[PDB]
Subunit: 221 residues, 4 copies
């Protein structure tokens, strides 16, 4: 038996709670990228992600981090901070696309997430929402940035989908018009977006049940 | 906006029907792996509390005893402990991995079990698409080094690693003389993690094949 | 056992004398960077406690204020805060990085500062071979995610990252009303880290060029010379 | 000297002379550990290339064979393969760790070997203050996951992990039929890593007791 558990708060999982009526609205995907370079492969990859997601039927919003103050260097009502926070609240899933800069995710990528709180009043800007992580680099393949982002996804309490993208030697993959050529990298991008839409459709309607936790029911009681 | 790099014959729209086939009626199958061979092992004792909770939640639970598991490539694959582990992984729909944190990392014993499990053995994918909960136990103050490592490892195994996780600090203090976890914030988190695992397993097991039906695979198949 | 893949002409037996040139006689030059712009910032307060210790150990210390630093690539490198940062990095012989743990990771402000520092600017290497101590602070229970990330980043900056480090848990509990760190195991550790950083910087600063004199670079330089001469039609 | 949290008796100013003791003459003792027991193992062949380089550079090199090593706690600290390993570690002044990347991480074999090495065994510190070079091999395209994990592990072992490291992608392409590594930028990196490890080990081995001498420990 279970002498450390409160049997009043323990609940058997309920199949019907996992299957509420399917929503019909476009899955809401926020896309963030980690560069302000004029020629930014992370931005250009974010845009390829957008085109795919839109094809699949998602409503996509891409946040431009230009003009974002450093965390705590402005009030939370700053135009770009409010935009980012409202975008996160609006989202049902997110794509984060970071350059790998000095073998890690970028300060721009992390500063965006730094500005997003786990909670504000009753609202949880990220909890339970789906996440796809992707990186790009001018050098040979690495996973340092996507590893950091996947751990970060846990801290934000997101459902980080298993598939992810790491594009090596990015300048070889994007043409003069900023479009990705057919490649194994591109096929991965398609798989990741494809998976993200499926996970978002699967989880969004029962997310409140999925985050209805024993410990929180216990503290309410 | 156009998609000149895509194979437009294999690119398909999401299908809602496919995310909701009829629910299976058999108990969710959960395999629990733990990362220590010590006689009194807090990871094993935590594994056992996980088992108890998962059973209450209606899962069929199996726990693998790693005692006698050879080092990876130190024995043939047909070694009994290897075959048993592989069979157990195949059988499972979701898993719990419970690792001590030793020298600020997951244990050699934990990693060795996962190293013995291949992504593909013939037509069978022992781990792909299955849910995963990660937990660690430590003799010292809080760290998440082991669970962070196991979470990255979950990606490499193509598992749906649930967001919640448990890290029990100074674990020796949290277990009584009967090997039972004491009531605490840590225990309530173990409840939450097991609760979450069952929900995600129920949610995903029946549409896993659709979730894992990939553009790049169809393209290569055509 | 021979070395068929090695260019024997660029191989060098490590030379003990070269690891001991005359000691420098100026104060070890330490740059401190921190990862918060909060009014009450425990990383900044920790940075200042680190400065006092370093100065007691005889270092010359400069602390960079990241306020007004543009986002990487959001301004020309001639931006006054960017020049300041790069100039301080070039000046430094060792560094301390003090990051909060925000969302379980090093902070965007911490990483943005390093993002603004190139491995190379012409012949100048702003970070290579220099010593580094990493430290973190958190509002919550202990973690090492942030110091772990910084330790890897120190490799990528080609720094000699010292084995010891500080992670202060529930940092608000450990600083008093004057912003001074209270006596504790955590403080004793900060002392050990600063003591260690100064020893490594003294040990290493004078022979850095030798430590950083690499086979593959001697091999490349030789190939490049030969190529340049050939392009000018010299037999 | 505005240091109120500090016990001013335990504080010493750094001593330049204590960083420069008479140089040792004996050859630098390096232990190599590898993370694969496969018949054809590129971490083992890489480990052997490391050995040849370090010997040329004037190190005395020992390589531990992890075969027959029991799993941790599956045998007493006295298991013969255990006695062998702790001691090779106690003998070494620096170490090379060479792990495959398996499932995007260092191997169980690599981890099990260091799990078996305590921070202390009474008064000896098999690892504290010793130098460390980390290297990985993969069958796939480049990654740093295994060397990243090993670098953090070097911190937990209190070692001086040198900045330079090796990661060899598609390692099967880089070794010929005789098990020798082919000339390449990967090989040139290996040379650099070994060269650096020898320099660091000569630099630090004599003043280690001074370097590992702490305010906190002599306060306690």
């Amino acid at each position: 038996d279970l002498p450390a558990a409160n049997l009043q708060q323990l609940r058997l999982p309920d199949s019907a709670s996992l299957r509420p009526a399917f929503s019909t609205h476009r899955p809401r995907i926020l896309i963030l990228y980690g560069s302000l370079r004029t020629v930014s492969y992370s931005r250009l990859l974010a845009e390829e992600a957008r085109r795919l997601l839109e094809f699949f039927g998602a409503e996509v919003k891409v946040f431009d981090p230009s003009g974002l103050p450093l965390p705590d260097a402005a009030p939370v009502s700053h135009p770009k901070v409010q935009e980012l926070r409202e975008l996160s609240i609006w989202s049902e899933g997110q794509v984060w696309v970071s350059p790998e800069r000095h073998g890690a995710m970028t300060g721009i990528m992390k500063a965006q997430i730094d500005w997003i709180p786990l909670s504000t009043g009753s609202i949880r800007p990220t909890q339970g929402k789906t996440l796809a992580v992707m990186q790009v680099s001018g050098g040979s393949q690495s996973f340092n940035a996507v590893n950091q982002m996947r751990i970060l996804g846990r801290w934000m309490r997101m459902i980080t989908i298993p598939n992810q993208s790491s594009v090596a030697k990015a300048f070889q993959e994007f043409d003069a018009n900023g479009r990705m050529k057919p490649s194994s990298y591109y096929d991965r991008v398609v798989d990741v977006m494809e998976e993200l839409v499926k996970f978002t459709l699967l989880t969004r309607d029962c997310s409140a049940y999925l985050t209805d936790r024993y410990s929180e029911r216990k503290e309410s009681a």
